[PDB]
Design an enzyme around this catalytic site. Structure first.
Site, PDB file in Angstrom:
ATOM      1  CB  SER A 140      -0.944   0.015   1.208  1.00  0.00           C
ATOM      2  OG  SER A 140      -0.236   0.026   2.437  1.00  0.00           O
ATOM      3  CG  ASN A 228      -7.522  -7.786  -0.590  1.00  0.00           C
ATOM      4  OD1 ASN A 228      -7.315  -6.649  -1.022  1.00  0.00           O
ATOM      5  ND2 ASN A 228      -7.223  -8.151   0.650  1.00  0.00           N
ATOM      6  CD  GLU A 254       7.777  -9.475 -24.374  1.00  0.00           C
ATOM      7  OE1 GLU A 254       6.614  -9.131 -24.689  1.00  0.00           O
ATOM      8  OE2 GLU A 254       8.290 -10.553 -24.748  1.00  0.00           O
TER       9      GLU A 254
HETATM   10  N1  LIG Z   1      -7.281  -3.121  -1.190  1.00  0.00           N
HETATM   11  C1  LIG Z   1      -6.793  -3.329   0.032  1.00  0.00           C
HETATM   12  N2  LIG Z   1      -6.309  -2.271   0.767  1.00  0.00           N
HETATM   13  C2  LIG Z   1      -5.815  -2.483   2.006  1.00  0.00           C
HETATM   14  C3  LIG Z   1      -5.775  -3.750   2.560  1.00  0.00           C
HETATM   15  N3  LIG Z   1      -5.230  -3.648   3.795  1.00  0.00           N
HETATM   16  C4  LIG Z   1      -4.924  -2.351   4.027  1.00  0.00           C
HETATM   17  N4  LIG Z   1      -5.304  -1.618   2.933  1.00  0.00           N
HETATM   18  C5  LIG Z   1      -5.141  -0.178   2.699  1.00  0.00           C
HETATM   19  O1  LIG Z   1      -3.784   0.113   2.980  1.00  0.00           O
HETATM   20  C6  LIG Z   1      -3.682   1.345   3.666  1.00  0.00           C
HETATM   21  C7  LIG Z   1      -3.139   1.068   5.061  1.00  0.00           C
HETATM   22  O2  LIG Z   1      -1.867   0.482   4.946  1.00  0.00           O
HETATM   23  P1  LIG Z   1      -1.523  -0.970   5.540  1.00  0.00           P
HETATM   24  O3  LIG Z   1      -1.102  -1.919   4.443  1.00  0.00           O
HETATM   25  O4  LIG Z   1      -2.692  -1.521   6.299  1.00  0.00           O
HETATM   26  O5  LIG Z   1      -0.321  -0.619   6.559  1.00  0.00           O
HETATM   27  P2  LIG Z   1       1.026  -1.489   6.666  1.00  0.00           P
HETATM   28  O6  LIG Z   1       1.692  -1.635   5.308  1.00  0.00           O
HETATM   29  O7  LIG Z   1       0.707  -2.836   7.252  1.00  0.00           O
HETATM   30  O8  LIG Z   1       2.021  -0.642   7.605  1.00  0.00           O
HETATM   31  P3  LIG Z   1       1.817  -0.364   9.181  1.00  0.00           P
HETATM   32  O9  LIG Z   1       1.625   1.121   9.336  1.00  0.00           O
HETATM   33  O10 LIG Z   1       3.080  -0.817   9.871  1.00  0.00           O
HETATM   34  O11 LIG Z   1       0.626  -1.127   9.709  1.00  0.00           O
HETATM   35  C8  LIG Z   1      -5.080   1.923   3.749  1.00  0.00           C
HETATM   36  O12 LIG Z   1      -5.255   2.804   2.658  1.00  0.00           O
HETATM   37  C9  LIG Z   1      -5.978   0.716   3.599  1.00  0.00           C
HETATM   38  O13 LIG Z   1      -7.196   1.086   2.997  1.00  0.00           O
HETATM   39  C10 LIG Z   1      -6.250  -4.824   1.821  1.00  0.00           C
HETATM   40  O14 LIG Z   1      -6.223  -5.962   2.282  1.00  0.00           O
HETATM   41  N5  LIG Z   1      -6.757  -4.602   0.559  1.00  0.00           N
END
Ligand SMILES: Nc1nc2c(ncn2[C@@H]2O[C@H](COP(=O)(O)OP(=O)(O)OP(=O)(O)O)[C@@H](O)[C@H]2O)c(=O)[nH]1
Ligand SMILES: Nc1ncnc2c1ncn2[C@@H]1O[C@H](COP(=O)(O)OP(=O)(O)CP(=O)(O)O)[C@@H](O)[C@H]1O
Ligand SMILES: Nc1nc2c(ncn2[C@@H]2O[C@H](COP(=O)(O)OP(=O)(O)O)[C@@H](O)[C@H]2O)c(=O)[nH]1
Ligand SMILES: [Ca+2]
Ligand SMILES: [Ca+2]
Ligand SMILES: [Ca+2]
Ligand SMILES: [Ca+2]
Ligand SMILES: [Mg+2]
Ligand SMILES: [Mg+2]
Ligand SMILES: [Mg+2]
Lengths: 438, 54, 349, 425
Positions: A140, A228, A254
């Site tokens: 993310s 997801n 590519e």
């Molecule tokens: N599409 C989707 N977005 C996600 C998911 N989990 C978290 N997000 C999004 O990711 C962002 C939050 O980041 P995270 O990935 O949860 O945080 P992290 O990478 O674990 O880092 P930390 O701060 O250490 O918890 C937000 O915008 C959420 O909406 C997921 O399973 N699917």
């Protein structure tokens, strides 16, 4: 045969990785215990699916994947899930406490302490590759880990694997499902630091997926699982060329060659159709013309923006299912007479098309209906710059008051990195302007 | 509008349709930045502990 | 209730629309930079279209169509008319025009000019550019060389256009004029032509001899109000409305405004707006648009109607501000944000 | 991610006791530490607040502190008194005489090392210590003076851990002694420097709610504490049950605190109870934002919200929740600063509190909280300009200059809030 190593970072990266490998196993006929009855070469081989799966002498097909999260609750799901038997401990890496949605905490404070462990686990997978292509990195923008640790990893990967390609699948932040208020800070900081280390990045805006799930799947309040499984379908259609026999996008290189004439402008827009609710027993099956036409509807894009008011640099159409070239060209001819499709003057006005006869696979009991044909369009259009402008504006509103900045400085980051990162995005916005505007 | 580079295999095929013609930081440098940030954190904690000792 | 922001304080039209909205008790105005708005009354330049439609739970509407500049910029209009198959290489209601830079037509222009000179036909052209406001930056010449010299002496892209040497002249006075039509296009791309137009007339008699005097030839309200005497002897503010003009056409030419002129005006409005609809429609967009347009027409002595230009940020005639602005609220705003006969003609398409 | 809970002084221990009664009930823990619940959600994050002992007993990770034994003898005799670890009662005999200097510098100084020993013992038992929460009042001597001394010593040993407090602000309407403004002003300065998040619980607001809304003609500290335990359960719901938003103390502070000193929160709760009718989501949303439902006696319409966290509990339409939350922001569109985009975050938990089918807890970082510190600052100055009641403090070795400095810092804090209440984009 050249291998690809997938790396999943943070909650979003891990949970999307879990959904993708579930789908890969369904597509390749691999059971949750790693067995693959159709694979007649036991314990080895250089088939197309071996680009993503290695093989043990016992016949297990093991994903070429590493999962990395700074807290263990999400990765423990992997360890105790349906496909737990697929991976082994060395592939799952968890820390004690997370980056608290703080880029600086993920990059500097905690990244420094875990980066060499992650690289070592990556080195072990690489040592099993006779011809490593490169890496696919899922994460993310908004999370402290997904933003901060990813950018550190990408810098070190460019060092340890200079010649290799690196592709990103990046989750762009959407307030409708967003946890933190500082995600614009983390997005800009990580894009700035990762820009020169990424050959091609596919942004997925949670707002778009959320809206597709509500509009097309009639899910009132979509969950991460809904999001997801839809994202994994798009990822699958994008990586299918690496895992199946084919001639288009059979190598990570590519992707750069077909989609990215300018290195910095390496964010193709993905559009996918059709998304049909499984609750609808009977659904009129869409034609090649109709799903192709749907690739030019903003409502089906992975990032909401208006490609009519931008310019195209490259355009790939990736079909799965009952599709033949005759129908594609007939559809394209019609769509061109009806749609605003302006290419930059220095690029050919054309489409690279790939067709994979196997129709999309859907998770049994999921929300997506089985369709006889689908398409994913990857188009490098300047219109995706709209997503940078939105993010940059939110950054600017908070940074003008230095709101939340003390959290980053407190982790050892200097204030100057903010404006340095922001000036980079300003230049990026100007690059898109100079390419697509008159 | 011409088609080119048609490749066919049992699993599918691919081609191109043309409508109109046209007209890195080192490892040492990374460890430097990481250690710089760690030292800034250490300095700030030393100030806190000094403040608390007062 | 509903919320809106105001980002063009210089709009006479939407200052009234905002005023009307507040007086409904169901709309609240917010600061210019508050993103949680239902309605944006946007700026004329650099309107941040890419930030619209991303506020969770808000249906957002803006009073401009992204991409309509193609129609409302003098250079772009010429290019759009010549290259759009829907408008063809030649459509009979737009004067022969060329784009000239100081993708350039400096050559094809001289070709038609030389042809006319050899035919000894009327060879008067008018150079102009959307960079000059208040009648500044125009040149009506019979010699092509004088036209091009005037162009190169500037830094703005220009268009050269054949001058309608045989305009319809009102009587008494032997006076030129143009017609302004206001057209509202709503979020569904319905085309609504305001039933009230205005003629912007020249106070001084038309002189086909010397074009040096830029008064009896230019019908702009500012040029007449400052450069011509007898401004206002025939009608208030050199503005004639449709009832009087229709009555005149009957008395003088035994015809009506609808038959002789309005059919062509409606055809031209439809053709222009239908042409760009695929490019600017917000039908499947995450935000919606409406926009008010000012179409400018010339009428020649054969009662043929010529389109002169399209204004994307028009003002209104003082007598018509109230009615039309109320019409904007009913048709464009309340249609998307409802509350608790018709002044427009719907141009079906 | 363990939290270590500390409760100090009379108010801190009476409110803390009720807090453990309430959440022990929610997690299915009986007064003897035995779990007798019926849902796995009760136990998934039980470790955050409870240790597990042999026999599958759950022991609150709680330390009870006081400078006299009276209130902690009540706790040990109270409903759940036997659930606490007996080694975690740390108390003196002298008392602190409602005197911040005694809590912070003399009587409290003598006892603080014993408290830190127990704190260290609980910390050492944590797989990954998240941080600390302290319950106390600011108007007395032990909770205020010794409580803030403890926070400073804790920050010294655990400088990288989060420190959160539930801090009861004094009011002349619910007062024990005239010196409460002195004690509170001295404590606020400590909190400005040494906590990451402080929930400001105003005894004035609690009284007003009991009197005007709950129609209690003669509210007691018991009545006020019913509001506080309900509020404390609400704001810790996202820490105690599976959830995505404000999941741990540090992520919460990152989302709630844009500037380090401005970390004092106005809590709110709905429905207010002391009735069998079902409460609709619109009602929950409207009430939780209503000033009459705020636990700090500040009108939010007098300032602007920097950040807001809202927690909904029970089975309800999450679509209606999002719909109502997005609605109320438009009704108060001007009371949210525009230079922190999307500064209102909403969480839902399926487990409702005891006796309610649904409820909503509000946590706002509002510049209106300056009204509370202004109130305290005026009461402080009315006495201090005449040096009234100062001998109680100079008798413990304090000097007037320390009062002058505390007052200056709280006025700085007020002017800090006013600065961001006028700020625009
Ligand atoms: N599409 C989707 N977005 C996600 C998911 N989990 C978290 N997000 C999004 O990711 C962002 C939050 O980041 P995270 O990935 O949860 O945080 P992290 O990478 O674990 O880092 P930390 O701060 O250490 O918890 C937000 O915008 C959420 O909406 C997921 O399973 N699917
Ligand atoms: N081709 C032509 N033939 C005859 N007269 C013309 C002409 N082009 C322009 N005119 C006259 O010149 C005037 C101004 O021309 P133009 O429309 O380019 O200026 P402008 O952009 O200021 C109109 P507006 O004041 O509505 O913005 C018109 O009102 C018309 O009387
Ligand atoms: N809400 C509430 N406030 C209390 C309680 N007990 C005392 N107070 C308030 O706390 C302040 C008195 O401090 P106290 O905690 O009794 O003194 P301490 O033992 O030295 O910490 C005054 O402002 C009282 O109004 C209680 O049980 N509930
Ligand atoms: Ca094999
Ligand atoms: Ca590289
Ligand atoms: Ca003693
Ligand atoms: Ca000791
Ligand atoms: Mg995480
Ligand atoms: Mg004009
Ligand atoms: Mg007391």
């Amino acid at each position: 045969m050249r291998e690809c190593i997938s790396i999943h970072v943070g909650q979003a990266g891990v949970q999307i990785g879990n959904a993708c490998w579930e789908l890969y196993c369904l597509e390749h006929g691999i059971q949750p215990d790693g067995q693959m009855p159709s694979d007649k070469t036991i314990g080895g081989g250089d088939d197309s699916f071996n680009t993503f799966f290695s093989e043990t002498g016992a016949g297990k097909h093991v994903p070429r994947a590493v999962f990395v999260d700074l807290e263990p609750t999400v990765i423990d799901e992997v360890r105790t899930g349906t496909y737990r038997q697929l991976f082994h401990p060395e592939q799952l890496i968890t820390g004690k406490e997370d980056a608290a949605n703080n880029y600086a905490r993920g990059h500097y404070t905690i990244g420094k302490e875990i980066i060499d462990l992650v690289l070592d686990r990556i080195r072990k997978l690489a040592d099993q590759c006779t011809g490593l292509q490169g890496f696919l990195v899922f994460h993310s923008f908004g999370g402290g880990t997904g933003s901060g640790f990813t950018s550190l990893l990408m810098e070190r990967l460019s060092v340890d694997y200079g010649k290799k390609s690196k592709l990103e699948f990046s989750i762009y932040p959407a307030p409708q499902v967003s946890t933190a208020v500082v995600e614009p800070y983390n997005s800009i900081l990580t894009t700035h630091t990762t820009l020169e280390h990424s050959d091609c990045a596919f942004m997925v805006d949670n707002e778009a997926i959320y809206d597709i799930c509500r509009r097309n799947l009639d899910i009132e309040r979509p969950t991460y699982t809904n999001l997801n499984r839809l994202i994994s379908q798009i990822v699958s259609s994008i990586t299918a060329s690496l895992r199946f026999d084919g001639a288009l996008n059979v190598d990570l290189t590519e992707f750069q060659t077909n989609l990215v004439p300018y290195p910095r402008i390496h964010f193709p827009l993905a559009t996918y159709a059709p998304v049909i609710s499984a609750e609808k027993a009977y659904h009129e099956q869409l034609s090649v013309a109709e799903i192709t036409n749907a690739c030019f509807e903003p409502a089906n894009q992975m990032v909401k923006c208006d490609p009519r008011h931008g310019k195209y640099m490259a355009c790939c159409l990736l079909y799965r299912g009952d599709v033949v070239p005759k129908d594609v060209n007939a559809a394209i001819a019609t769509i061109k007479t009806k749609r605003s499709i302006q290419f930059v003057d220095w690029c050919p006005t054309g489409f690279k098309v790939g067709i994979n006869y196997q129709p999309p696979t859907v998770v049994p009991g999921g929300d997506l209906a089985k369709v006889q044909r689908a398409v994913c369009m990857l188009s490098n259009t300047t219109a995706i710059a709209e997503a940078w402008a939105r993010l940059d504006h939110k950054f600017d509103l908070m940074y003008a008051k230095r709101a939340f900045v003390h959290w980053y400085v407190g982790e050892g980051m200097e204030e100057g990195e903010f404006s340095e990162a922001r000036e980079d995005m300003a230049a990026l916005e100007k690059d898109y302007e100079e390419v697509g505007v008159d | 509008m011409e088609v080119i580079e048609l490749n066919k295999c049992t699993s599918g095929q691919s081609f191109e349709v043309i409508l109109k013609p046209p007209s890195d930081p080192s490892l040492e440098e990374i460890q430097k930045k990481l250690e710089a940030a760690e030292e800034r954190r250490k300095y700030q904690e030393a100030e806190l502990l000094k403040h608390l000792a007062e | 209730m509903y919320t809106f922001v105001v980002r063009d304080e210089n709009s006479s039209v939407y200052a009234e629309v905002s005023r009307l909205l507040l007086a409904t008790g169901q709309w609240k105005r917010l600061r210019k930079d508050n993103p949680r708005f239902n309605l944006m009354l946007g700026e004329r330049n650099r309107l941040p279209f890419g930030r619209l439609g991303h506020e969770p739970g808000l249906v957002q509407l803006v009073n401009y169509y992204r991409g309509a500049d193609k129609l409302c910029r003098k250079a772009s209009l010429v290019k759009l008319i010549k290259t759009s198959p829907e408008l063809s290489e030649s459509c009979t209601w737009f004067p022969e025009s060329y784009v000239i830079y100081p993708t350039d037509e400096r050559e094809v222009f001289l070709a038609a000019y030389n042809r006319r000179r050899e035919g000894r036909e009327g060879n008067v052209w008018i150079a102009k550019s959307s960079a000059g406001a208040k009648g500044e930056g125009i040149l009506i010449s019979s010699e092509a060389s004088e036209l091009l010299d005037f162009i190169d002496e500037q830094g703005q892209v220009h268009v050269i256009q054949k001058y309608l040497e045989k305009p319809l002249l009102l009587e008494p006075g032997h006076r030129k004029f143009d017609i302004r039509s206001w057209v509202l296009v709503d979020h569904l791309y319905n085309i609504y032509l305001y039933r009230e137009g205005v003629l912007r007339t020249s106070s001084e008699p038309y002189n086909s001899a010397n074009f040096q005097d830029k008064t009896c030839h230019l019908t702009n309200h500012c040029i007449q109000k400052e450069y011509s005497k007898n401004y206002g002897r025939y009608e208030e503010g050199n503005e004639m409305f449709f009832e009087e003009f229709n009555q005149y056409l009957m008395d003088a030419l035994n015809t009506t405004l609808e038959n002789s002129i309005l059919l062509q005006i409606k055809h031209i409005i439809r053709s222009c707006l239908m042409c760009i609809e695929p490019a600017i429609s917000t039908k499947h967009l995450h935000y919606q648009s409406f926009q008010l347009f000012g179409f400018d027409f010339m009428v020649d002595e054969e009662l043929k109607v010529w389109l002169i230009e399209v204004n994307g940020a028009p003002a209104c005639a003082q007598k018509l501000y109230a009615e039309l602005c109320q019409g904007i609220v009913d048709v464009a705003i309340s249609s998307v944000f409802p509350l608790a006969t018709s002044i427009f003609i719907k141009l079906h398409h | 991610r363990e939290i270590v809970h500390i409760q100090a002084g009379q108010c801190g221990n009476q409110i803390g006791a009720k807090f453990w009664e309430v959440i022990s009930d929610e997690h299915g823990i009986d007064p003897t530490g035995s779990y007798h619940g019926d849902s796995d959600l009760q136990l998934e994050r039980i470790n955050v607040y409870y240790n597990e002992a042999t026999g599958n007993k759950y022991v609150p990770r709680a330390i009870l502190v006081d400078l006299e034994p009276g209130t902690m003898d009540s706790v040990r005799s109270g409903p759940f008194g036997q659930i606490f670890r007996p080694d975690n009662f740390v108390f003196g005999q002298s008392g602190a005489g409602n005197n911040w200097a005694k809590g912070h510098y003399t009587e409290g100084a003598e006892l603080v090392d014993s408290v830190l020993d127990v704190v260290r013992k609980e910390s050492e038992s944590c797989d990954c210590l998240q941080g600390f929460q302290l319950t106390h009042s600011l108007g007395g001597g032990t909770g205020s003076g010794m409580g803030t001394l403890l926070i400073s010593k804790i920050r010294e040993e655990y400088p990288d851990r989060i420190m959160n407090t539930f801090s009861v602000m004094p009011s002349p309407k619910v007062s024990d002694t005239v010196v409460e403004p002195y004690n509170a002003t001295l404590s606020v300065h400590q909190l400005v420097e040494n906590t990451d998040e402080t929930y400001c619980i105003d005894n004035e607001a609690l009284y007003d709610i009991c009197f005007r809304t709950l129609k209690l003609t003669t509210p007691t500290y018991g009545d006020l504490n019913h509001l506080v335990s309900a509020t404390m359960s609400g704001v810790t719901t996202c820490l105690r049950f599976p959830g995505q938003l404000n999941a741990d103390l540090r992520k919460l502070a990152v989302n709630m605190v844009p500037f380090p000193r401005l970390h004092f929160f106005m809590p709110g709760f709905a429905p207010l109870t002391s009735q069998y009718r079902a409460l609709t989501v619109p009602e929950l949303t409207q009430q939780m934002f209503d000033s009459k439902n705020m636990m700090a006696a500040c009108d939010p319409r007098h300032g602007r919200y920097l950040t807001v966290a809202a927690i909904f509990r029970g089975r309800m339409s999450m679509k209606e929740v999002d719909e109502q939350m997005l609605n109320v922001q438009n009704k108060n569109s001007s009371y949210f600063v525009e230079w922190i985009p999307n500064n209102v975050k909403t969480a839902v938990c399926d487990i409702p509190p005891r006796g309610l089918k649904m409820s909503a807890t509000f946590i706002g970082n509002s510049t209106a909280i300056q009204e509370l510190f202004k109130r305290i600052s005026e009461q402080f100055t009315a006495m201090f300009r005449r040096k009234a009641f100062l001998h109680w403090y100079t008798g413990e070795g304090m000097d007037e200059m320390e009062f002058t400095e505390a007052e200056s810092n709280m006025n700085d804090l007020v002017s800090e809030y006013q600065q961001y209440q006028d700020a625009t984009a």
